[PDB]
Design a protein around this ligand. Structure first.
Ligand code: A1CIF
Length: 262
């Protein structure tokens, strides 16, 4: 598409390639062009176009779709990862953590209410604008990072919307620590490091018929030992996100009404 001129590679992998490009027809503004090499794909881009009609402030704008598939998004200069690496001591200000978490949960509630599950939420696809706005990116299309993966994904049992609320809890903790809460090197090591903190759940909370039984893995530790800067209300919301059983985990909609945000 000669309407765009690629100037830098943002990333490459399974998702094809994402480039930073000049939108030659729209005043030369920067855009992120995702080049991705059917019915599943056709339906997925139709869902992305539908979400864009709402123009939610907490998800990246989808400017164009070309067809061999190219998605054109607004460009955001930085991700949450870079924002956390550059924030000076003593860290992210308490009210900035609160604001970014509120916006993250609004973008996620928007996706969950239109039955889209992100499934790969991490600082790398949580974008931070020059005005401090949070914009979700890299969703809707089907070292590594299991650090934000929910226990039910690691166990290979369920994949519903609560999967993103576990990721939100990991990210919430990381905004205080400025280092990942659960840094595992494999699916089983990730689950062990999770249970080292939250403790073994009740036998009835363990999913039936999975390869890994409860027996393969522990007592709950005070979460403030790992997130020292967190307040009482923040702690209550953090634990509601880091609940082992997905049916008992708080939703993004209820999280938005938690006393922490009042
Ligand atoms: C896999 C994937 N799919 C993506 C996608 F569809 C869109 C974008 C995207 N990226 C950006 N910008 C990037 C943000 C990160 N930074 S940083 C902090 O300097 O490293 C580079 C920057 O060019 N803006 C909007 C997007 F939609 C980024 C995407 N990614 C990765 C690079 C996070």
């Amino acid at each position: 598409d000669q309407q765009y001129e690629c100037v830098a590679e943002i990333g490459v992998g399974a998702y094809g390639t994402v480039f930073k490009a000049r939108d030659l027809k729209n005043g030369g503004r920067f855009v992120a062009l995702k080049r991705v090499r059917p019915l599943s794909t056709i339906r997925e881009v139709a869902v992305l176009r539908h979400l864009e009609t709402f123009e939610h402030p907490n998800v990246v704008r989808l400017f164009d779709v070309c067809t061999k598939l190219t998605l054109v998004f607004e460009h955001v200069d930085q991700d949450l990862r870079t924002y956390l690496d550059k924030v000076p001591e003593p860290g992210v200000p308490t009210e900035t953590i609160k604001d970014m978490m509120f916006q993250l949960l609004r973008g996620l509630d928007f996706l969950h209410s239109h039955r889209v599950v992100h499934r790969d939420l991490k600082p790398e696809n949580i974008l931070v604008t020059s005005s401090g706005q949070i914009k979700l990116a890299d969703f809707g299309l089907a070292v590594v990072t299991l650090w934000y993966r929910a226990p039910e994904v690691l166990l290979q049992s369920s994949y519903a919307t609560p999967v993103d609320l576990w990721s939100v809890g990991c990210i919430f903790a990381e905004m205080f620590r400025r280092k990942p809460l659960f840094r595992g090197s494999s699916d089983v090591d990730q689950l062990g490091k999770i249970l080292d903190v939250i403790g073994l759940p009740g036998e009835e909370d363990w999913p039936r018929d999975v390869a890994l039984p409860r027996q393969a893995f522990k007592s709950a530790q005070p979460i403030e030992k790992f997130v020292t800067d967190i307040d009482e209300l923040g702690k209550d919301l953090l634990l509601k996100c880091l609940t082992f059983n997905p049916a008992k985990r708080i939703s993004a909609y209820s999280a938005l009404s938690h006393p922490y945000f009042q």
